[PDB]
Each structure stands twice: as structure tokens, then as C-alpha cells.
Coordinates of C-alpha atoms in Angstrom, one line a residue:
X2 CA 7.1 -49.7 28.7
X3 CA 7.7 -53.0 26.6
X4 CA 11.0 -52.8 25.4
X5 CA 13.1 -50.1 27.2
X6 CA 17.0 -50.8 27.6
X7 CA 18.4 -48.3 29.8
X8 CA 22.4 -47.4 30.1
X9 CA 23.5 -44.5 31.9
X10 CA 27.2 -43.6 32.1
X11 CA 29.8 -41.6 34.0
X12 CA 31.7 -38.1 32.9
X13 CA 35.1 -39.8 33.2
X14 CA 34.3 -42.7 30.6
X15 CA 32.8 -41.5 27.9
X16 CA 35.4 -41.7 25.3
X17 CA 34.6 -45.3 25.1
X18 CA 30.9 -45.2 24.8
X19 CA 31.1 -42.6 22.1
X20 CA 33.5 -45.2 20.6
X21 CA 31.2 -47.9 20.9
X22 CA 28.4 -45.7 19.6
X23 CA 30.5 -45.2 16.4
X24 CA 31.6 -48.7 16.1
X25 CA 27.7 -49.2 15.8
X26 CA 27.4 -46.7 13.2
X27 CA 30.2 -48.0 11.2
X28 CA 29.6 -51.3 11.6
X29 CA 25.8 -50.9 10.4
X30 CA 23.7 -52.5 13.2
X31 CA 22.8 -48.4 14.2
X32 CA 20.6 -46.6 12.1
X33 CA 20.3 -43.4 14.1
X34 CA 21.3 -41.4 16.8
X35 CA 19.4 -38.8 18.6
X36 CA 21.3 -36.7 20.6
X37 CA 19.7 -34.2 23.4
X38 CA 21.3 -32.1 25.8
X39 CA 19.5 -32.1 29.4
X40 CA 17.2 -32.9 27.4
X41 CA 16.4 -30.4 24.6
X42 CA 17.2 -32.2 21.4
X43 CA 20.4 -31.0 20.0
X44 CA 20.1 -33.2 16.7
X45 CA 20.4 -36.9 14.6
X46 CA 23.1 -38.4 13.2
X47 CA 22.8 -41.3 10.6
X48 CA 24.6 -42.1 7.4
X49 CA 23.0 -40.5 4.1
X50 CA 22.7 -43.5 2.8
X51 CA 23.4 -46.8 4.9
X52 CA 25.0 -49.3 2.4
X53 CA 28.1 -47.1 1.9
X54 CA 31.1 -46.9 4.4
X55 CA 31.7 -43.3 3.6
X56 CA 28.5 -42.4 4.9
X57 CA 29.0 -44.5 8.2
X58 CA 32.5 -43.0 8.8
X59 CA 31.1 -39.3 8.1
X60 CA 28.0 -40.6 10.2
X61 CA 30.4 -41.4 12.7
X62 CA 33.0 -38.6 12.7
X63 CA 29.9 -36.4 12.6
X64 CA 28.9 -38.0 16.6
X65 CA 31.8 -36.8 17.7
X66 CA 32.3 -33.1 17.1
X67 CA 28.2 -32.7 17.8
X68 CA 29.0 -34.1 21.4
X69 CA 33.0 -33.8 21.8
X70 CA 33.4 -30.5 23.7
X71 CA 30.0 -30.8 25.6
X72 CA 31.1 -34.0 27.3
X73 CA 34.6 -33.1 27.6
X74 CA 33.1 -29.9 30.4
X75 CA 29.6 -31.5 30.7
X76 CA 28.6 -29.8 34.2
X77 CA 27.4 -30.6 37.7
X78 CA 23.7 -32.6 37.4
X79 CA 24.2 -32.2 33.5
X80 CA 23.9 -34.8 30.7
X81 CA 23.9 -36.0 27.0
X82 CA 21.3 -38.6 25.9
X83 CA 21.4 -40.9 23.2
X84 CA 18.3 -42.4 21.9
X85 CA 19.9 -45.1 19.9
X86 CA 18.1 -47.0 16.8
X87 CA 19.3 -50.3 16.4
X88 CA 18.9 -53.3 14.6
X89 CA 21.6 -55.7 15.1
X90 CA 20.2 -57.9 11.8
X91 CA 22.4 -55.0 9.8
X92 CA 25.0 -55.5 11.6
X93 CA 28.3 -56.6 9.2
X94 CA 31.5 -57.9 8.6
X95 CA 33.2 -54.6 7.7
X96 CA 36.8 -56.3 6.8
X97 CA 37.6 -59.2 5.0
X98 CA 40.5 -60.1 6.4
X99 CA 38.3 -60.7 10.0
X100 CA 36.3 -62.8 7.1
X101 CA 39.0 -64.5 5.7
X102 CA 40.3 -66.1 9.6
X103 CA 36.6 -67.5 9.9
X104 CA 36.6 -69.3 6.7
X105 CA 40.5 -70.8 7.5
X106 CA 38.8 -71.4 11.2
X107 CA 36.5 -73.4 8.8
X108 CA 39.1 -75.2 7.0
X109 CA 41.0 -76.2 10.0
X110 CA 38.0 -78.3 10.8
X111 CA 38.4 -80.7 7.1
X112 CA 40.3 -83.1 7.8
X113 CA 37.9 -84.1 11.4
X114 CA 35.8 -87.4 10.9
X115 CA 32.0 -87.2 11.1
X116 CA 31.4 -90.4 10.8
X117 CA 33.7 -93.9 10.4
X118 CA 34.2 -96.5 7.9
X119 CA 31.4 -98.7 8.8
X120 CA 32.2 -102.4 10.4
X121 CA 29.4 -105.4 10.3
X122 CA 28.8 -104.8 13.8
X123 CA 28.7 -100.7 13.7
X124 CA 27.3 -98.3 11.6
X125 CA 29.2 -96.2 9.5
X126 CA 29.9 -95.0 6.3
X127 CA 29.2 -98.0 3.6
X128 CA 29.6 -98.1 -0.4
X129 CA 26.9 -97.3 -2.6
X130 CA 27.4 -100.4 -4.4
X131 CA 26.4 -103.0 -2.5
X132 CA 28.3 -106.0 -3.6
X133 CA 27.7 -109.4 -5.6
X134 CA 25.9 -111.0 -3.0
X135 CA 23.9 -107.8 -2.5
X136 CA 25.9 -107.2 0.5
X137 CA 26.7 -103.3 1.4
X138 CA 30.7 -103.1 1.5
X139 CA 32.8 -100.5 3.7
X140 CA 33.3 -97.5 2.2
X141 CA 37.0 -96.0 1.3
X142 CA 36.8 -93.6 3.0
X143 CA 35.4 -92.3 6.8
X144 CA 33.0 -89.2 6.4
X145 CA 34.9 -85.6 6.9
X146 CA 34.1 -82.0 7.3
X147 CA 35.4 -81.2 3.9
X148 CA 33.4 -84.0 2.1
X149 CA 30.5 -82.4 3.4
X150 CA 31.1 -79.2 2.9
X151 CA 33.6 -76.2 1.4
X152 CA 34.1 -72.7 2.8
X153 CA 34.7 -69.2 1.5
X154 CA 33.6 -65.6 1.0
X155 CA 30.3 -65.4 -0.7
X156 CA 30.8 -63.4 -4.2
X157 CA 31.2 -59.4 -4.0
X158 CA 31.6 -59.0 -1.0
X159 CA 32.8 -54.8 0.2
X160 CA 33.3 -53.2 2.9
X161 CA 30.2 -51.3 1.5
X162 CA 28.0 -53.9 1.9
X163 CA 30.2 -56.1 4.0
X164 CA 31.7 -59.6 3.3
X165 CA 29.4 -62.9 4.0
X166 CA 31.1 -66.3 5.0
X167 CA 29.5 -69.3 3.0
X168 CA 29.6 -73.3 3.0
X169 CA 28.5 -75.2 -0.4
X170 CA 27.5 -78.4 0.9
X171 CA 29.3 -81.1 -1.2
X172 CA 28.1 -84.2 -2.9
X173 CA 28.5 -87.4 -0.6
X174 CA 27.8 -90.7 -2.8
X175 CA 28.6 -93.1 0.3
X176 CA 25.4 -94.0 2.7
X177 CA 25.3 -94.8 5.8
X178 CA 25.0 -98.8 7.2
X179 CA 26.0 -101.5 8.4
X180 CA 28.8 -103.9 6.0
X181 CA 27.3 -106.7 4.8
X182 CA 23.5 -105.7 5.7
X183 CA 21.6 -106.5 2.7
X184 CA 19.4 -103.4 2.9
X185 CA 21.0 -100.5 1.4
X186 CA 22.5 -97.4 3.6
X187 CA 20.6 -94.1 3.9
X188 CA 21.8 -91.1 2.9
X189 CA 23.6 -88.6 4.6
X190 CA 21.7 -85.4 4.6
X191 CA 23.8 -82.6 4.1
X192 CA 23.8 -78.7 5.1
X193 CA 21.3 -77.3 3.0
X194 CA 20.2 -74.1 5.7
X195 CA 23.0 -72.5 7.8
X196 CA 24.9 -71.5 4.4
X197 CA 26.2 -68.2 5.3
X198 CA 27.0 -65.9 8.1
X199 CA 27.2 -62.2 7.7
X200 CA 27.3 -61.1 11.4
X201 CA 24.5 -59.9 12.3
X202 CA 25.4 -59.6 15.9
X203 CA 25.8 -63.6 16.1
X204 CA 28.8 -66.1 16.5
X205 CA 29.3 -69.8 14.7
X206 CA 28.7 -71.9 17.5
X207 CA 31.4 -74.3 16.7
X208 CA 30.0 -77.1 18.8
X209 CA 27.0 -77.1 17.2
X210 CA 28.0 -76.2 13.2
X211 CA 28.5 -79.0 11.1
X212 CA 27.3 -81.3 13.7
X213 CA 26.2 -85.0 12.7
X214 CA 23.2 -86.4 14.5
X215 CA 21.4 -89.7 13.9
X216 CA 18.0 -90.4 14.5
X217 CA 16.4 -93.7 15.6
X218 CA 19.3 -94.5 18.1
X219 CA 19.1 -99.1 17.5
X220 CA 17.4 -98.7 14.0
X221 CA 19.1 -95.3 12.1
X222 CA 16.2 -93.9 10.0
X223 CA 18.2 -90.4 9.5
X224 CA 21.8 -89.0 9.3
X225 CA 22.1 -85.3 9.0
X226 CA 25.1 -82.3 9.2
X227 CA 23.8 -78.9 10.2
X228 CA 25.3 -76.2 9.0
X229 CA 26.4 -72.8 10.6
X230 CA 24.5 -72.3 14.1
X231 CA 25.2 -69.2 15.8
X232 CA 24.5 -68.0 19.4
X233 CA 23.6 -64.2 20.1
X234 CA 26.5 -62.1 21.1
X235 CA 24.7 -59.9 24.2
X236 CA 21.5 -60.0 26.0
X237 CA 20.2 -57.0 23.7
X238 CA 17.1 -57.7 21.8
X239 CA 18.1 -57.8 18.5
X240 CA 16.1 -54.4 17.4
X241 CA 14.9 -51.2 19.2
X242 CA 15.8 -48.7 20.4
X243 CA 18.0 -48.2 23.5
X244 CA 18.8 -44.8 25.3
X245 CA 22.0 -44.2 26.6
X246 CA 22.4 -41.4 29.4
X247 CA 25.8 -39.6 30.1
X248 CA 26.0 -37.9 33.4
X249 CA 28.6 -36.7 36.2

């Protein structure tokens, strides 16, 4: 069948799955739990209502004890299934302190040049103003990661609803040329998709967030910065439904 994910694990270690099922729960990316025992249907588990951590700690509590002493004496050729609901889009940033390091991650990265001062013979970040003889003129300063961007917690953020990371692109007057070229520099384009990350079962790809690239290689026609890029944390599909077996 089109989109099956099997797992099937032993007696001995399933402390840690149980763990990792709860994790899920509490951490929002699992919506529900059904439970069966060899395999009559023993019951569901799922917070009362998903946007509060309460609910996704009773949710989670409430997994243990419903399968605690049958796995801790599951017998010979016995087992517990989980037919876990997933959707790794809900998955959060529970704390904001593991919020907090990403954003001064961020900010340890403002003070890296994007792109130079421009020379006559390279291109690079020019004036506005181009000068009396109509002449771009270097710029003051090189282009860097905090001109082009700053970094914090989106606004009310809980651990209800969990805590978003977010860049506000800034405003860059300086243009990109060639000094002394009489034709005006083009404008950087700044991150304007890529604002936030909230999880979500992704990572910032630092290589690839708040990456310059220039298009037209000889003759620049466009300068741009992305903004957050992310790369999938497992080979999961990002929704469905996966069952997990416990056996001995």
C-alpha cells in the first residue's frame, strides 16, 4: 500500500520508543495514537485539545500507564502496536530558550561580508549617489549579514503554541556595480520568503540561508540574499501514518 512506514521493535528497548512516541506527542508533530494489543484495539491517546501543552503532557503521561505494565511482562510471540498519526508540519519549538540559541546562532553570523566594497575593476557594493561626473562611487561600507537582515522570536510566542524564529529583512540603500561605471548599480534583493522557522521537523541549512547569489556571471542583471532554507530532519514523509510494532 502507498505510504506504509513500518518499525518493529524489541522487548528489551522499549522504554525509549515509548519516549520517543511521547516526545512526538509533546512536541505536536503526533496527533494520535492507537494502541492494540496482539492486535485487539486496546484504545487512542491524543491531547483534548492540541494547542495546549497540558493536554500534550496528559496525552503523553496517559501512553504510558495504557501500555507500561504490558510491555514491562509482554509475553513469548506477544506485542503492542502503535498506529501512529503524524504530521511533522505541527511539529514545534516547545522551549524558548532552544529558540533563543538559534536566533544568537543568527547573530553570530552579522558581522560576515556578503559582498565587498566595489573597486573599478570588480563589482561590489557602490553608492547610490553616483558622483559629479555621474560616476558610481564605492560604497562605505561592504554588504553584511546584519545589514540585510535582523533576527528574533516572532511576537507571542508559548510553549502552548510554540516559539517561531524570524528575520526582518533590513533596508540596503547601497547597489551593486562597478566604481566609476556610469550606469547605475542594481539593487540588492533582500529576503523577503524564508522569514521564519517554527520547526516543523526541518533545520536552517546554514550554507544555504542568507546566501548571496548573482545572476548574469560577466554582465550582473540580479543580486539576491535568501532567507532561511531548511533541510528535512529524517527520511519520513512529512505526514501519515506510521505503525510501530513491539515484540519479544
Amino acid at each position: 500500500t502507498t505510504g506504509t512506514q513500518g518499525y518493529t521493535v524489541v522487548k528489551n528497548d522499549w522504554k525509549k520508543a515509548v519516549k520517543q512516541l511521547q516526545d512526538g506527542l509533546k512536541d505536536n508533530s503526533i496527533g494520535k495514537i492507537t494502541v492494540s494489543f496482539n492486535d485487539g484495539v486496546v484504545g487512542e491517546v491524543a491531547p483534548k485539545s492540541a494547542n495546549k501543552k497540558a493536554d500534550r503532557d496528559a496525552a503523553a503521561e496517559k501512553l504510558y500507564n495504557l501500555v507500561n505494565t504490558q510491555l514491562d511482562k509482554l509475553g513469548d510471540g506477544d506485542y503492542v502496536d502503535f498506529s501512529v498519526d503524524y504530521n511533522l508540519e505541527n511539529k514545534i519549538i516547545t522551549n524558548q530558550a532552544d529558540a533563543e540559541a538559534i536566533v544568537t546562532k543568527l547573530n553570530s553570523l552579522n558581522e560576515k561580508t556578503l559582498i565587498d566594497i566595489a573597486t573599478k575593476d570588480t563589482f561590489g557594493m557602490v553608492s547610490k549617489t553616483q558622483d559629479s561626473e555621474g560616476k558610481n562611487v564605492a560604497a562605505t561600507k561592504a554588504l553584511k549579514v546584519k545589514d540585510v537582515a535582523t533576527f528574533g522570536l516572532k511576537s507571542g510566542g508559548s510553549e502552548d503554541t510554540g516559539y517561531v524564529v524570524e528575520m526582518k529583512a533590513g533596508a540596503v540603500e547601497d547597489k551593486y556595480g562597478k566604481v566609476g561605471d556610469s550606469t547605475a548599480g542594481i539593487a540588492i534583493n533582500l529576503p523577503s520568503t524564508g522569514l521564519e522557522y517554527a520547526g516543523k521537523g526541518t533545520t536552517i541549512d546554514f550554507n544555504k540561508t542568507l546566501k548571496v547569489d548573482v545572476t548574469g556571471g560577466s554582465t550582473p542583471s540580479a543580486v539576491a540574499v535568501s532567507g532561511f532554507v531548511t533541510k528535512d530532519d529524517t527520511d519520513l514523509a512529512k505526514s501519515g501514518t506510521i505503525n510501530v510494532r513491539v515484540i519479544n
